[PDB]
C-alpha cells in the first residue's frame, strides 16, 4: 500500500532555469531540486557544475507554487541537489526529516510533472540501488517518502533513468544511491 500523499502534495513546486523545468520540494523557506536544472541540453553531456553555478544569479531561477511565483533570494549546491532560498516560508510544511534508506526497504513515490502531483505508488530499493519506478520526461525532483505517525521521512529525490528502464536518484542531502553520476553518459545497473 502507498502512504496517503496529502502532506507531500503541499510541498511540491515547479523550478525553471532557462528552458529546463523540473520539480522541487519546498520546506520552510528552502526549495530542494536536482542540480541538473542549471544545465542546457548540451551541458548535460559533460557538466562542469561548479562553473555553471557561478554563471547563474538568483533571478535566473523561476520557482512557482501553482500560479504564485516565489522570489529566489539565495542559492547553493549540496552534492547533487540545489538549494534555493526563497522569501516565503511554506505554510503547509509538515513535520519532516531526511533519512537515507537501505536496499530492501520500501517507500512511497509521489510522481509529479510541472510541479503538479500526478500519482502515488510504492517502490522498493533493489540491491544495486535502483528502483523500478514509473517516471517520464519532467519527473525529476519527484520525491520518495514514508510516514511515521505525523512525521514525513523524505528518502529519495528522482534524477535519472537507466538503459534497462530502472531509475536512480539521491537522498535529500544530494548523495546518490549507488555508483551513479548526474551526467548523460554511459551508465548501467
Ligand atoms: C528528469 N526530469 C529526467 C527523468 C528521466 C526521463 C526519462 N525517464 C526518467 O526518469 N532525467 C534526466 O533527463 C536525466 C538527466 C540528464 C539525462 N537523464 C537521463 O535520465 C538519461 N539517462 C542517462 O543518461 C543514463 F542512462 F545514463 F542514466 C535519459 C537518456 C534522458 C533517460 C541527466 C543530467 C542524467
Residue numbers in the entry: 6 to 194
Provide excerpts from the study:
MPro1–196-GC373 and MPro1–196-NMV complexes crystallize in the isomorphic monoclinic unit cells with a P21 space group. Superimposition of the independent molecules in MPro1–196-GC373 (and in MPro1–196-NMV) with a monomer from the mature MProWT dimer39 clearly shows that the native dimer is not formed by the juxtaposition of the two independent molecules in these crystal structures. Thus, in agreement with our solution measurements, GC373 and NMV can covalently bind to the monomeric MPro1–196. Another salient feature is residues 189–194 belonging to the S5 loop which become ordered in the inhibitor complexes even though both inhibitors lack P5 groups. A close inspection of the oxyanion loops in the MPro1–196-GC373 and MPro1–196-NMV complexes reveals that residues 139–142 adopt the native conformation in both structures. Thus, covalent inhibitor binding reverts the oxyanion loop geometry to its active configuration. Direct hydrogen bond distances differ by only 0.1–0.2 Å in the two structures.
The fully active mature MPro is a homodimer, with one active site per monomer, and exhibits a monomer-dimer dissociation constant (Kdimer) in the low micromolar range. Domains I (residues 8–101) and II (residues 102–184) exhibit a chymotrypsin-like fold, and domain III (residues 201–306), comprises a cluster of five alpha-helices connected to domain II by a long loop (residues 185–200).
